[PDB]
């Protein structure tokens, strides 16, 4: 499909697939995201789903493998560097009841 369209399409399809199982939930895609981008995404979903559960799906096929130091990779704004994101920080922003 060419690079850009494919990424939106995969995001669209992935949403549909999940909607077979849970059709009544706010889905919010992050597509080749930054770190700030993930922070604003997760912190918003915890605000809304106050004490009820939030799903965090991470698909890291295009980025290097997660490190021994408890890190998961995302991008920088320009898509020129793989930025690491701490699992600690990731579980800060996401709340308690989560999957």
């Amino acid at each position: 499909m060419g690079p850009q369209k494919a990424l939106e399409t995969i995001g669209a399809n992935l949403q549909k697939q999940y909607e077979n199982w849970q059709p009544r939930a706010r889905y919010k895609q992050s597509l080749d995201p930054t770190v700030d981008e993930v922070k604003k995404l997760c912190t918003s979903l915890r605000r809304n789903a106050k004490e009820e559960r939030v799903l965090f799906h991470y698909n890291g096929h295009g980025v290097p493998r997660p490190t021994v130091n408890g890190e998961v990779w995302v991008f920088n704004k320009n898509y020129t560097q793989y930025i690491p994101l701490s699992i600690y920080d990731l579980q800060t922003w996401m709340g308690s009841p989560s999957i």
Binding site: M1, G2, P3, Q4, K5
Partner: protein, 684 residues
């Protein structure tokens, strides 16, 4: 003839001789050919003397008697001079057509043709199938009946030579062509059927592939927005869009068309409701709602179009995916002597070239086992290119026959051209090539040189470069040339070769190949030779031209940025030759070619006359103005002027060395080059 000329006293004499020549040696090719062509000039002398005197009652009735005395001999002579070549008879065969189409409506000329067409071998006509099918629908009945009957019999032996051009005619917009063309296919069905129906499908599917719906809507809405928002032509704007709405009213025939109709199609149909409300109300508030919907899809399409780097057949045309072991042969491979290299199967992916027009890169597997790559162009008429390649074929024959040329291996690199409609067609992909613009770009990024360096130097010196007077421009232009070493191509030809004994051979080929197309291009009138339109063979070193739209000096006459140049011979091309310069191989090859063309000028004229006077292709000449038969004579007079060395001053007659000297000055002149459009790159 050389002493006297052509006139009232010489024609009866020179015919008296040539008739005798013919008597004394019946079998001899030239004795008949000379007789025929002399008679044929005795026609055009008396036709052009009638238009010179009579136009500028009894004279047209005398002209019937007068020309028919020289027309029937000419035909009978050309028919015998075809049967005595049997191999190299293109000149002779085209002249027969020119006679037939113009004068064949006469009873006596018609008889001569009927008797001739019987005697002659059917293999001869395969040369001129293009020229025949162009006149498939001639309004004159007695002419057109004999064309049909001839094409029919070309169908019964060598149907592979006919299906492609007939199938293009069969889906023609004009009524008479498609009637005539279909009637001939109906005859071909009971010979083949499977072949006809295979070709009928393949061509329909290839056209569908060549321009998708979202590509058509993009070009249509760009054109429709310019008519409405620019010119305020509302009725003409509907002519652009109403076929596109009616186009989709077939429905989704393939998955790509489904997914278009899925995403956008609902809105387009809704926007048509506002347009159809405007036709019976006449409101500004109605029609602005439609352009809101059109610009919604237009922006969404424009965002998509760069992402279509490749098209899969499963989506775009599944009919073609299914195709196995077709009897219908690979386009532009058919030869009546060789065994048919029939289509095994079409490859599933289409590598879309990222250009303005977005051509595909189609590839077919042959029954011989070899892949054949093509370039499937959409919305760019290829009938010119088809004719121009017919000319290069002729010229290659002439260079092969001359020993001087043959010893040097002079020839024009040509490729297959297969039209599929008025818009689209296949071009044969030449391997191991890349455009001169591409080469220089890639060299300059490697060597860290700014790509627009010559341009940047000019605009620094004089930021109003475009608006400067001629002399002002020449100063600025020269300042750029003196302050940039224009050796990029010379340097990269060295770097890109393995040994130096190979390098040397590549460079020899390069120089000669260039010279051949400089001269051939000059005669043809071929303009628009910017560095994207010529490409260099990365093994042989030979040059190759592409894009033959601007022929017969059309780009010299155009209003904004008229070319003042016979051919591209700018300082990068020159530096890539031997360091001594133009005056070695290039200038000498230029002589050798221009000697061959000047000798065989009737052969070159015969071909060029054929595709100037073709009424399907004449539209290119009239369009420069802001009736046609007047303009068409001027073109062909000029071609004779060039081929006779009466092209700089009609008073003088230059020999080849003198003519080639003035041409090289004209191409090399800074005054001429600085006036060129900047995209032409007058400094490479």
């Amino acid at each position: 003839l050389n002493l006297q000329g052509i006139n009232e006293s010489t024609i009866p004499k020179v015919l008296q001789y040539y008739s005798a020549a013919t008597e004394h040696d019946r079998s001899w090719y030239k004795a008949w050919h000379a007789w025929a062509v002399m008679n044929f000039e005795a026609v055009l002398h008396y036709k052009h003397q009638n238009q010179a005197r009579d136009e500028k009652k009894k004279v047209t009735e005398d002209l019937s008697k007068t020309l028919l005395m020289y027309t029937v001999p000419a035909v009978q002579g050309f028919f015998r001079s075809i049967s005595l070549s049997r191999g190299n008879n293109l000149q002779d065969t085209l002249r027969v057509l020119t006679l037939w189409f113009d004068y064949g409506h006469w009873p006596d000329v018609n008889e001569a043709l009927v008797e001739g067409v019987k005697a002659i071998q059917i293999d001869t006509w395969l040369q001129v199938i293009p020229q025949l099918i162009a006149r498939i629908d001639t309004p004159r009945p007695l002419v057109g009946r004999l064309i049909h009957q001839l094409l029919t019999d070309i169908g019964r032996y060598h149907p592979q030579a006919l299906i492609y051009p007939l199938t293009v005619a069969s889906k023609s917009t004009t009524t008479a062509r498609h009637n005539a063309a279909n009637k001939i296919l109906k005859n071909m069905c009971e010979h083949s059927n499977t072949l006809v129906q295979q070709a009928m499908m393949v061509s329909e599917e290839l056209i569908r592939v060549a321009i998708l719906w979202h590509e058509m809507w993009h070009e249509g809405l760009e054109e429709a927005s310019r008519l409405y928002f620019g010119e305020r032509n509302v009725k003409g704007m509907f002519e652009v869009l109403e076929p596109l709405h009616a186009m989709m009213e077939r429905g989704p025939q393939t998955l790509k068309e489904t997914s278009f109709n899925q995403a956008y199609g609902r809105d387009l149909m809704e926007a048509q409701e506002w347009c159809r409300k405007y036709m019976k109300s006449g409101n500004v508030k109605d029609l602005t709602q439609a352009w809101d919907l059109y610009y919604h899809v237009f922006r969404r399409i424009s965002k998509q179009l760069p992402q279509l780097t490749s098209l899969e057949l499963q989506y775009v045309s599944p009919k073609l995916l299914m195709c196995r072991d077709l009897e219908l042969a690979v386009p532009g491979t058919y030869d009546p002597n060789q065994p048919i290299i029939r289509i095994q199967s079409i490859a599933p992916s289409l590598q879309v070239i990222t250009s303005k027009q977005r051509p595909r890169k189609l590839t077919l597997m042959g029954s011989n086992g070899h892949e054949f790559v093509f370039l499937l162009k959409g919305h760019e008429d290829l009938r010119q290119d088809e004719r121009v390649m017919q000319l290069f074929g002729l010229v290659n024959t002439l260079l092969a026959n001359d020993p001087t040329s043959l010893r040097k291996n002079l020839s024009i690199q040509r490729y297959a051209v297969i039209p599929l409609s008025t818009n689209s067609g296949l071009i044969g992909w030449v391997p191991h090539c890349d455009t001169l613009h591409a080469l220089i770009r890639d060299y300059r990024e490697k060597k860290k040189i700014l790509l627009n360096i010559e341009h940047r130097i000019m605009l620094r010196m004089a930021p109003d470069y475009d608006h400067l007077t001629l002399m002002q421009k020449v100063e600025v232009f020269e300042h750029a040339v003196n302050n940039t070493a224009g050796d990029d191509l010379a340097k990269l030809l060295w770097l890109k070769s393995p040994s130096s004994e190979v390098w040397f051979d590549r460079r020899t080929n390069y120089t000669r190949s260039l010279a051949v197309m400089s001269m051939v291009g000059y005669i043809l009138g071929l303009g628009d030779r910017h560095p994207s339109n010529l490409m260099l063979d990365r093994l042989s070193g030979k040059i190759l031209h592409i894009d033959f739209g601007d022929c017969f000096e059309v780009a010299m006459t155009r209003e904004k940025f008229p070319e003042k140049i016979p051919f591209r011979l700018t300082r990068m091309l020159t530096n890539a030759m031997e360091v001594t310069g133009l005056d070695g191989n290039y200038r000498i090859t230029c002589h050798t070619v221009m000697e061959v063309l000047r000798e065989h000028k009737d052969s070159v004229m015969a071909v060029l006359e054929a595709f100037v006077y073709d009424p399907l292709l004449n539209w290119r000449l009239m369009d420069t103005n802001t009736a046609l038969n007047k303009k068409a004579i001027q073109i062909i007079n000029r071609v004779r002027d060039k081929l006779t060395g009466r092209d700089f001053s009609h008073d003088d007659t230059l020999d080849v060395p003198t003519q080639v000297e003035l041409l090289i000055k004209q191409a090399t002149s800074h005054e001429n080059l600085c006036q060129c459009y900047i995209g032409w790159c007058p400094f490479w």
